[PDB]
Amino acid sequence: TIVDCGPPDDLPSGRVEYITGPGVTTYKAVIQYSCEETFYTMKVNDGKYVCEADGFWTSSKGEKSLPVCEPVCGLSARTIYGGQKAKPGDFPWQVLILGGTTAAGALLYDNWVLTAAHAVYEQKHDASALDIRMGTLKRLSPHYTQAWSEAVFIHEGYTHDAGFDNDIALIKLNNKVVINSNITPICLPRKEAESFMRTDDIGTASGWGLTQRGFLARNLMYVDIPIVDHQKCTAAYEKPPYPRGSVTANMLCAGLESGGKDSCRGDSGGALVFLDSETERWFVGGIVSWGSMNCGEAGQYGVYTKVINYIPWIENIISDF
Ligand code: NA
What we know:
By secondary structure, this protein is mainly β. It has three domains: 1-72, Complement Module, domain 1, CATH 2.10.70; 80-93 and 187-309, Beta Barrel (Thrombin, subunit H), CATH 2.40.10.10; 94-185 and 310-317, Trypsin-like serine proteases (Thrombin, subunit H), CATH 2.40.10. Helices cover 8% and strands 31% of the residues. Strands 7, 14, 15, 16, 17, 18 and 19 form a seven-stranded antiparallel β-sheet that branches. A six-stranded antiparallel β-barrel has the order 8-9-10-13-12-11. Strand 17 (271-276) and strand 18 (281-290) form a beta hairpin. The site of sodium ion has 6 residues, from loops. Homodimer; disulfide-linked. Binds MBL2. Isoform 2 binds to MASP1. Binds SERPING1. Dimerization and MBL2 binding requires calcium ions.
């Protein structure tokens, strides 16, 4: 009359292995879950489950739910105006988004893309699936990893063509991307990531947007730029033709007084990344949002969506879908 927990549930990006015996799922039987460990790490459990008296597989912590295989994030082979050419593995989360004008995003997990709302607003509201490409440095190459949007979430505080407050969006991909050295997600900022995002701290913008030549780049470029004091950045946009209060608390600014280093038209949606020097992992602190019309203009800093403000929103959507 012994209870049978049956076959273990499927562990996405993982595997079930029988400890007691091949295919034995009766009371007291033990199994071990593991992840594809090169690119994924097991979270919330050590993966040891046992058949309980109630017919359920339960962890060492007594949880009825599965462990989670989570893509390793923030790896880089490092360890756009006035920049230089990226190398393979430099920005493996970098995503190209087509359909409208050139835009970009950053891979999260193995099935989400973080981008700017302004970059995808028109396409989403024309009910057109987004053509999403990764694993390539060359914008116009026929060789890339193809993904397709299943859903686009635009922040509900964003108002298209009326300022860039809340300029953030999430794309759910219809399939998991195969994670490798050339394709890995960026890390979301942890609580204390602000300690690496103070005035004068260095972030990196990457993209295929306009260079100093005034044309899009064929190959992925990047620049390191300092975070700019918020009041200083606010004052820089306190003039025509900008509407009052264009720079908000949901934005950070980055760039030089001289304009020598900047993100431009076409860089939209890209992640402004920073290095957590303690974990040695890169994370996304900003999204390429807006700036003055002319790229690399002196005294007109690039303005980025302040990603850390949207962690609850991001976690709400990713957890719920
Ligand atoms: Na500008």
